[PDB]
Amino acid sequence: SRLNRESVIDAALELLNETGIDGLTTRKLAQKLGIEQPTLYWHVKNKRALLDALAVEILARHHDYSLPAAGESWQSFLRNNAMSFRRALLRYRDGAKVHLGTRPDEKQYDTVETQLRFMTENGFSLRDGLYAISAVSHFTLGAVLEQQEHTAALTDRPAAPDENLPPLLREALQIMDSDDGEQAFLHGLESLIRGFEVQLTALLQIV
Amino acid sequence: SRLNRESVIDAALELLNETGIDGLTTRKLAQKLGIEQPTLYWHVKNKRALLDALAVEILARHHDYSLPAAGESWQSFLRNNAMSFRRALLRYRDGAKVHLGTRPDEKQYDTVETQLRFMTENGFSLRDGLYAISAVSHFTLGAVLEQQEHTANLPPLLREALQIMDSDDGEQAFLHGLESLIRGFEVQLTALLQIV
Numbered sequence: 001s002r003l004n005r006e007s008v009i010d011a012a013l014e015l016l017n018e019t020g021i022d023g024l025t026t027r028k029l030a031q032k033l034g035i036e037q038p039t040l041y042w043h044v045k046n047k048r049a050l051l052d053a054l055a056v057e058i059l060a061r062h063h064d065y066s067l068p069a070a071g072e073s074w075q076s077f078l079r080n081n082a083m084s085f086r087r088a089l090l091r092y093r094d095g096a097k098v099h100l101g102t103r104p105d106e107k108q109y110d111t112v113e114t115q116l117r118f119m120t121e122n123g124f125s126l127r128d129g130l131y132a133i134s135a136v137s138h139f140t141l142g143a144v145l146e147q148q149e150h151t152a153a154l155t156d157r158p159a160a161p162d163e164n165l166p167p168l169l170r171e172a173l174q175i176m177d178s179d180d181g182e183q184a185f186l187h188g189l190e191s192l193i194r195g196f197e198v199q200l201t202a203l204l205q206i207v
Numbered sequence: 208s209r210l211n212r213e214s215v216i217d218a219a220l221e222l223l224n225e226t227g228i229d230g231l232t233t234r235k236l237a238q239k240l241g242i243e244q245p246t247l248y249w250h251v252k253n254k255r256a257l258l259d260a261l262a263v264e265i266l267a268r269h270h271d272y273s274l275p276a277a278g279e280s281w282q283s284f285l286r287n288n289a290m291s292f293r294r295a296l297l298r299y300r301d302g303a304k305v306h307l308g309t310r311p312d313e314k315q316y317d318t319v320e321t322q323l324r325f326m327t328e329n330g331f332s333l334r335d336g337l338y339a340i341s342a343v344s345h346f347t348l349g350a351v352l353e354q355q356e357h358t359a360n361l362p363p364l365l366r367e368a369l370q371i372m373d374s375d376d377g378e379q380a381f382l383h384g385l386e387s388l389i390r391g392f393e394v395q396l397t398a399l400l401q402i403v
């Protein structure tokens with residue numbers, strides 16, 4: 001194969017969907033590309049280096065609501081931004097676990113800076129703006145991880161005997177499974193956003 | 208060693224703190240207990256079975272705000288419940304990654320049912336009550352995961368920002384975020400059929 005950055009990464013992403021993060025090794029990537037290991041080592045030093053790069057690339061390719069639109073309200077930006085972030089994490093098996101074990105890349109700095117400036121120029125102290133942005137991040141991350149890791153454990157685990165399930169719980173699990181968690185996610189998201197709105201509005205009032 | 212359930216699990220928890228979740232294997236647990244692998248297999252079939260049990264045990268031992276107090280408001284129960292959940296996840300290395308993607312165990316049923324009933328008795332449709340409880344769960348999980356991970360130039364606002372989240376473990380960002388969630392649910396509940 002061709003062995004530039006882009007090709008190595010295209011191959012790595014496909015491999016990730018076949019094996020998931022734990023079955024992703026340098027040996028298997030060498031095979032898939034049709035090359036010996038020392039050849040690969042020249043381009044890719046080890047597993048950590050590869051993951052760091054996949055993290056960055058998943059967002060660069062698929063997280064396209066990174067910045068506010070012109071005139072857009074902070075509420076709406078938080079909404080769209082979070083939607084875009086879940087979509088991207090979901091696009092690859094173990095996407096979220098790949099992201100988690102990484103920190104922001106040079107390329108991502110000034111995208112995040114712009115996000116922080118945008119909140120402050122809308123009335124948030126730098127602190128409160130960061131808290132808001134983190135909260136949305138964490139909530140999203142956790143919601144996707146519980147979806148993805150729950151479906152990764154359906155392999156080695158039994159079913160729950162609906163027999164001894166109590167009634168509310170039984171109805172509750174049927175509801176989680178009716179979709180991917182999108183509804184619970186969007187509903188939760190609105191509650192977060194309004195909660196930040198109440199905090200901002202209050203200023204120095206007791207609220 | 209003794210090889211009952213409790214002993215295997217005590218050992219598994221210690222091992223978890225030494226290796227973290229990726230270095231937790233059946234081979235290494237056998238060694239730690241001073242036994243051959245087939246001996247272990249009789250008690251523990253594989254890694255998944257072990258993790259399912261650790262998940263359940265971490266909470267059974269350390270998650271002690273799992274039911275409402277008498278007279279307690281739903282707001283307050285969500286608050287205390289989430290604090291207690293975070294504390295328990297934090298007590299062991301990779302505690303949160305252990306919990307990921309588990310569902311309630313037979314011996315948790317009573318407890319989670321009671322939590323759902325409590326919300327409905329407080330005015331939530333079963334659906335809206337579940338969404339609230341999940342949102343708290345997911346948010347807490349994500350916040351603990353980013354803490355636990357990230358104990359493994361640069362533009363101005365961001366650099367001021369990162370200094371601020373490193374000033375503690377993330378507890379402040381968590382508790383602040385938590386209050387925003389709770390109030391947000393309050394606004395939704397109290398609106399009823401109003402447009403809000």
Ligand SMILES: CN(C)[C@@H]1C(O)=C(C(N)=O)C(=O)[C@@]2(O)C(=O)C[C@@H]([C@]3(C)OC(=O)c4c(O)ccc(Cl)c43)C[C@@H]12
Pocket residue numbers: 059063065066081082085103104108111112133134136137138353369
């Ligand atoms: C989901 N969005 C809110 C953000 C996002 O749009 C991006 C992005 N690259 O466009 C992030 O990287 C984010 O998704 C993201 O994951 C990071 C996150 C944040 C606040 O920025 C950080 O610099 C940073 C950090 O260094 C440590 C923890 C956290 Cl939570 C953060 C900002 C995230």
Ligand SMILES: CN(C)[C@@H]1C(O)=C(C(N)=O)C(=O)[C@@]2(O)C(O)=C3C(=O)c4c(O)ccc(Cl)c4[C@@](C)(O)[C@H]3C[C@@H]12
Pocket residue numbers: 169172173176266270272273288289292309310311315318319340341343344
């Ligand atoms: C963190 N806290 C809100 C909850 C908690 O107190 C639990 C507990 N055992 O005491 C949980 O198991 C929970 O932490 C917890 O783990 C829950 C959860 O896992 C979950 C899943 O995955 C699927 C369906 C349901 Cl109904 C649940 C559910 C709602 O029971 C939650 C409850 C929470």
Ligand SMILES: [Mg+2]
Pocket residue numbers: 306309310311
């Ligand atoms: Mg759970």
